[PDB]
């Protein structure tokens, strides 16, 4: 009576197919769960209340196969549980939403359907599936607003969007970990009613909830009470109290039963790449604050470097001053580059990890998608940083030297970005990745051709300089600025042992090596948040 009941009890997107079953038999879990045995069928909603979950994982993570060794048996649709059968028949809705903030509900659902539905489906079929998913979860009044965490949607609306993302491919088994976590009482009641309506079809819904505040408990169809890992009661909720009254444990008046009984104790790689790059572009080109911050950084550093080494006026730039200017142009951007790239990578770790675990893409198209999505903003940053620097310093006039300088700076910053991507994909923590990237940057900086002359290096610093993109950048800029003017100042130093095209090819090879490192890191290392 106190909650909203003026709603629509219609099921717009039901499950068509054979009923799905989930039978667990004598589940034993250590490093916890002892002799757990239940059997649920499609059309029923099971809520696991109590102290469920041993450590980093939970009970439903044990059911799916995540997590720490099992000693029982788990059956999915009459067949033993397997890492492929689970991802083929079971959908999982974690307690932490991982959604792009700049996209709307309709756009996110369309992207997830284009990356989930088979390639034989028509565009009208995908649109109809998205519309059915929107209508079933009552998101028709929010399909045109963004999912920003930013104004965005509400908490219950975001949870419904996550449920729809996990429901687009029409799963027969759905599991949710703490769906009402951080939601208002009425919003939690509405979400539980929506989950019960979803279970009212031909779907098997499992829910992991810690504390139902005496309104969520009244909506439970089947409940599983767990105490310190072992089950106490399994059956309907409305009879639970009765089951405890017939054995000698009556529930006192004005006391929630749950609280009392717990205190008692297709489509293809190319299509995947296209969808991923389109989604990344649509999400990144709408983040005005981040783009403005990057542009401000680039413009500030470029103006500082150009006015510090201002070549116009009375006195012209000296040779040592020009060398210092080139070295600073080469070695000042990696700080901000590493910072931004590592921050953006660690801000998207959970979503990428969960989409790789669910099976959206095969970690191959994601690499090229991320690279080609970083390319346009990288080119804009390179323009803003380099072009209002070559003229402010009054460098070598002409079109060819300026274009060569711009191309070399672009390639070197691209190599630095790929190195940052690899360092982020290789280390699990933001601080460790930042420290490793700073160590590599300092090594390549000391290995530069401006401070240790490239001759006071015995064996290892020489090789580091040979594999340092900053040294090659400095040498290429020196060759562009001083060769054919002129070459003897290049020959007294050691900036004359490699031609310009060789330096460009070496930079491209370093970029390719860093790309291979980033790819093998994405492939063979789990991107755990």
């Amino acid at each position, epitope marked *: 009576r106190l909650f909203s009941s003026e709603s629509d*009890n219609s099921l717009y997107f039901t499950y068509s197919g054979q009923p799905n079953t989930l039978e667990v038999r004598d589940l034993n879990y250590q490093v916890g769960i002892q002799n757990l045995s239940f059997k649920v069928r499609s059309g029923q909603m099971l809520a696991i209340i109590g102290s469920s979950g041993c450590g980093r994982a939970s009970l439903l993570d044990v059911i799916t196969g995540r997590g720490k060794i099992k000693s029982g048996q788990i059956w999915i649709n009459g067949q033993p549980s397997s890492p492929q059968l689970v991802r083929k028949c079971v959908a999982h809705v974690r307690q932490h939403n991982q959604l792009l903030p700049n996209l709307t509900v309709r756009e996110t659902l369309a992207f997830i359907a284009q990356m989930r539905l088979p390639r034989t489906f028509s565009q009208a079929q995908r649109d109809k599936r998205v519309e059915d998913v929107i209508a079933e979860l009552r998101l028709r009044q929010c399909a*045109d607003t963004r999912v920003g965490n930013v104004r965005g949607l509400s908490g219950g609306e975001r949870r419904r969007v996550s449920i729809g993302v996990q429901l687009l491919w029409n799963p027969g088994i759905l599991i949710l970990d703490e769906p009402t976590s951080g939601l208002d009482s009425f919003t939690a009641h509405n979400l539980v009613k929506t989950l019960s309506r979803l279970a009212k079809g031909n779907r098997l819904v499992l829910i992991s909830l810690h504390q139902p505040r005496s309104d969520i408990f009244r909506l439970f169809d089947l409940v599983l009470l767990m105490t310190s890992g072992t089950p106490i009661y399994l059956g309907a909720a409305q009879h639970m109290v009765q089951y405890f009254t017939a054995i000698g444990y009556p529930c006192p008046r004005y006391s929630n039963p749950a609280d009392f009984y717990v205190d008692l104790t297709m489509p293809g790689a190319v299509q995947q790449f296209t969808t991923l790059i389109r989604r990344q572009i649509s999400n990144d080109f709408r983040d005005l604050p981040t783009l403005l911050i990057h542009g401000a950084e680039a413009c500030l550093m470029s103006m500082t470097i150009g006015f510090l080494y201002f070549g116009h006026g009375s006195i012209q730039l000296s040779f040592m001053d020009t060398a210092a200017l080139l070295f600073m142009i080469g070695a000042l951007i990696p700080f901000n580059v590493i910072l931004d790239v590592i921050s953006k990578c660690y801000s998207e770790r959970a979503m990428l990890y969960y989409e790789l675990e669910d099976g959206l893409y095969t970690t191959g198209p994601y690499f090229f998608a991320k690279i080609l999505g970083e390319l346009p903003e990288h080119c804009a940053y390179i323009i803003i940083y380099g072009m209002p620097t070559y003229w402010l310093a009054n460098l070598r006039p002409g079109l060819q030297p300026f274009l060569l300088h711009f191309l070399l700076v672009w390639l070197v910053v691209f190599c630095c970005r790929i190195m940052a991507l690899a360092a982020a994909a290789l280390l699990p923590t933001f601080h460790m990745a930042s420290f490793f990237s700073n160590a590599l940057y300092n090594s390549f900086y000391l290995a530069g051709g401006f401070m240790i002359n490239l001759s006071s290096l015995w064996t290892v610093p020489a090789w580091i300089s040979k594999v340092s993109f900053l040294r090659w950048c400095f040498e290429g800029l020196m060759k562009i600025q001083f060769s054919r003017r002129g070459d003897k100042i290049l020959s007294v130093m050691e900036l004359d042992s490699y031609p310009l095209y060789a330096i460009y090819l070496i930079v491209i090879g370093l970029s390719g090596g860093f790309m291979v490192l980033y790819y093998v890191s994405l492939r063979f290392i789990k991107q755990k948040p």
Partner: antibody
Framework: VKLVESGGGLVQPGGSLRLSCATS????????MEWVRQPPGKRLEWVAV??????????DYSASVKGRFIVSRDTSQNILYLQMNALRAEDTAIYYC??????????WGQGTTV | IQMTQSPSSLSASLGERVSLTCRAS??????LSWLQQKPDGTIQRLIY???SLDSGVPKRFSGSRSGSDYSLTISSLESEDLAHYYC?????????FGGGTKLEI
């Protein structure tokens, strides 16, 4: 798709009347079915809805007719039935028989006056 | 959700263009339908999703959205367009209809 209403007549308050809607041209079991009346001085009012087979053929009515109207279907002949009891208090309209409420009211009928 | 349709009555002639507006009290996200009821009593859905057209509907009927208003535009009016027009929302329960517009000639 063809929707043909029938059963409209003259019944003053106190009695009852059953209107029929002869559907044809589509699978009657896989689509909703709505009754939506139109009084003379009232723009339009959705009256009742009967869901498809996937919803176990549950029904719903508006607050103005909840408790007096009963919508049902004959899945063998594909015919909508609307039994109105204690009617004509203010329910004199041109009741129409449409297919889909949630997907936009499409494929209307012709309406019967009562 | 209250659907205010403007105007309640409109008079024009052949060759002219007509634009009927519908304002929703809440956000419907384009889930609007334009229905035509002929003088005999037959009702036919002219536009669904506020932008799309039904099969068998002349391509002169179009749907536009200006802010929070949805407009049905009938270019090159004909004598067959003398009928009642209704806007309808179906984004939220229950489904409510518009005030109506009698397009006279």
């Amino acid at each position: 798709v063809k929707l043909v209403e029938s059963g409209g007549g003259l019944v003053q308050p106190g009695g009852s009347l059953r209107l029929s809607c002869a559907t044809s041209g589509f699978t009657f079991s896989e689509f909703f079915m709505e009754w939506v009346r139109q009084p003379p001085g009232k723009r339009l009012e959705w009256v009742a809805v009967s869901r498809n087979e996937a919803n176990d053929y549950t029904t719903d009515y508006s607050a103005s007719v909840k408790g007096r109207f009963i919508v049902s279907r004959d899945t063998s002949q594909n015919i909508l039935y609307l039994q109105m009891n204690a009617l004509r208090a203010e329910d004199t309209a041109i009741y129409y028989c449409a297919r889909d409420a949630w997907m936009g009211f499409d494929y209307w009928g012709q309406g019967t006056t009562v | 959700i209250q659907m205010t349709q403007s105007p309640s009555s409109l008079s024009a002639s052949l060759g002219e263009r007509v634009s009927l507006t519908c304002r929703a009290s809440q956000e419907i996200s384009g889930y609007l339908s334009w229905l035509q009821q002929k003088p005999d009593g037959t009702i036919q859905r002219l536009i669904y999703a506020a932008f799309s057209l039904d099969s068998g509907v002349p391509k002169r009927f179009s749907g536009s959205r200006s802010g929070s208003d949805y407009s049905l535009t009938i270019s090159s009016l004909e004598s067959e367009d003398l009928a009642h027009y209704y806007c309808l929302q179906y984004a939220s329960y229950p489904c409510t209809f518009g005030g109506g517009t009698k397009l006279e000639i």
